[PDB]
Amino acid sequence: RGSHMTPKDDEFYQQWQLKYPKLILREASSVSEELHKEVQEAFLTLHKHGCLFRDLVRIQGKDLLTPVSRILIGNPGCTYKYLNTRLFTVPWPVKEAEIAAACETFLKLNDYLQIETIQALEELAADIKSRAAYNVTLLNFMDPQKMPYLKEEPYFGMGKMAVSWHHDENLVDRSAVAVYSYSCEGRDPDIWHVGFKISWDIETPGLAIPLHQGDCYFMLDDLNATHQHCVLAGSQPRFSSTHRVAECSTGTLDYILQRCQLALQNVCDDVDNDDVSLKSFEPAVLKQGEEIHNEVEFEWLRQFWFQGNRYRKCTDWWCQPMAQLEALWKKMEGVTNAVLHEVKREGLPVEQRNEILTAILASLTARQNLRREWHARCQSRIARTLPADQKPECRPYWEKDDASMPLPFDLTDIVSELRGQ
Numbered sequence: 001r002g003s004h005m006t007p008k009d010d011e012f013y014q015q016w017q018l019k020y021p022k023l024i025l026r027e028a029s030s031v032s033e034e035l036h037k038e039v040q041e042a043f044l045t046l047h048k049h050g051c052l053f054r055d056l057v058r059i060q061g062k063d064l065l066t067p068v069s070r071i072l073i074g075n076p077g078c079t080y081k082y083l084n085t086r087l088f089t090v091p092w093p094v095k096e097a098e099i100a101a102a103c104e105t106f107l108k109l110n111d112y113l114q115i116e117t118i119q120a121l122e123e124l125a126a127d128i129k130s131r132a133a134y135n136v137t138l139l140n141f142m143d144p145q146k147m148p149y150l151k152e153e154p155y156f157g158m159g160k161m162a163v164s165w166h167h168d169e170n171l172v173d174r175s176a177v178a179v180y181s182y183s184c185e186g187r188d189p190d191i192w193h194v195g196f197k198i199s200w201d202i203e204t205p206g207l208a209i210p211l212h213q214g215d216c217y218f219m220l221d222d223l224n225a226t227h228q229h230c231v232l233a234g235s236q237p238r239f240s241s242t243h244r245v246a247e248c249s250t251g252t253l254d255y256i257l258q259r260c261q262l263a264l265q266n267v268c269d270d271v272d273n274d275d276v277s278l279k280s281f282e283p284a285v286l287k288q289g290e291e292i293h294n295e296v297e298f299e300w301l302r303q304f305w306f307q308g309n310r311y312r313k314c315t316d317w318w319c320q321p322m323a324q325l326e327a328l329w330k331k332m333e334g335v336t337n338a339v340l341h342e343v344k345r346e347g348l349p350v351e352q353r354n355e356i357l358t359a360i361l362a363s364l365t366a367r368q369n370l371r372r373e374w375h376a377r378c379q380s381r382i383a384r385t386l387p388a389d390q391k392p393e394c395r396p397y398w399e400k401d402d403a404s405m406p407l408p409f410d411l412t413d414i415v416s417e418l419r420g421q
């Protein structure tokens with residue numbers, strides 16, 4: 001067989017206490033009814049404006065649309081990488097307008113939980129501030145019964161799930177997660193539950209916590225790593241706000257901006273034109289530049305633009321920044337070209353001084369592979385199905401013709417010829 005526990009079982013309560021003490025629950029009772037109304041209104045305003053999109057993930061080789069539609073709200077400049085997609089924050093007021101009100105709400109929500117979390121983390125150890133320093137929240141929506149047949153929980157016969165077993169990933173080590181469940185209206189199939197199991201462990205029965213409108217749970221400390229969770233579906237739909245501490249070293253605007261400036265230190269920077277000349281060709285510096293070229297291209301631009309007309313429906317925040325990274329990136333094409341022009345140069349011990357080859361070739365093949373991968377996903381069959389406001393753009397894109405660009409989108413030729421050298 002395969003078993004699980006609910007409050008309907010007696011074992012449940014001691015199971016919770018002895019094998020899940022880091023999982024905390026605070027029921028709707030324990031939360032301001034002022035706040036309850038406000039965040040439930042905020043979900044609705046957001047939903048009504050169509051801010052919550054399914055994501056076209058590319059998990060484990062295959063393109064998939066997520067049943068759950070979502071939006072990330074949080075710090076200005078912050079990102080959160082979830083199944084190879086990098087979601088960008090619609091921002092909240094850390095120190096069109098209905099939307100800005102909801103973002104506010106969720107900050108308030110954020111700050112409240114942050115308190116609750118600090119509290120419980122103290123009561124627990126009985127470090128902290130940072131591990132509850134929630135920088136973002138990922139909101140979710142699912143149903144009404146729009147899934148024609150839904151997946152069965154395979155191990156404990158918990159029935160139908162919205163989200164299969166996983167870990168919430170790309171978070172600060174030993175960091176917490178807080179979750180406000182808004183249901184609107186064995187385990188009761190009509191009610192939404194969060195499910196829990198110990199990782200690897202399929203025969204300790206799992207736990208299935210009913211979630212009613214306004215209930216809140218908390219994954220403290222290493223719980224999220226030691227255990228897996230899933231979401232079991234109800235009969236009605238549900239919203240949730242899941243506040244996290246994303247590890248955003250390498251995942252903020254200011255970070256990526258600096259990286260660009262670091263790369264453009266190797267260019268003579270008197271004037272913005274197409275005579276791109278460089279201060280050195282010590283391969284190490286050229287490594288670094290071409291890596292950064294990749295980093296901004298694929299981790300920010302292609303990834304941003306795959307989400308298409310999505311953010312502009314929520315906010316214009318990223319427009320200037322994303323235009324600027326494009327300009328920054330365009331110049332980095334300039335440098336690639338320049339680096340090419342210097343290898344195929346009459347002088348230069350074209351022997352020995354082809355370490356400017358083993359410094360860059362990886363970076364450039366990777367540029368080619370990834371470029372195919374992102375082109376593919378943008379005009380694959382599933383990407384057409386998507387709405388005209390949503391469908392992925394493959395940006396930045398230019399034809400072998402297009403003059404302004406000093407290099408081709410590639411296909412390969414270059415990289416072939418550089419193998420040959």
Ligand SMILES: N#C/C(=C\c1cc(O)c(O)c([N+](=O)[O-])c1)C(=O)N1CCCOC1
Pocket residue numbers: 082083138139140163164166167168169170179194229230231240241242
């Ligand atoms: N679980 C989750 C949720 C997101 C999520 C985050 C990840 O890092 C991740 O890897 C996956 N994932 O692999 O399906 C999902 C979620 O939004 N929830 C589940 C609980 C209550 O509220 C909604």
Ligand SMILES: [Zn+2]
Pocket residue numbers: 166167168229
């Ligand atoms: Zn999760």
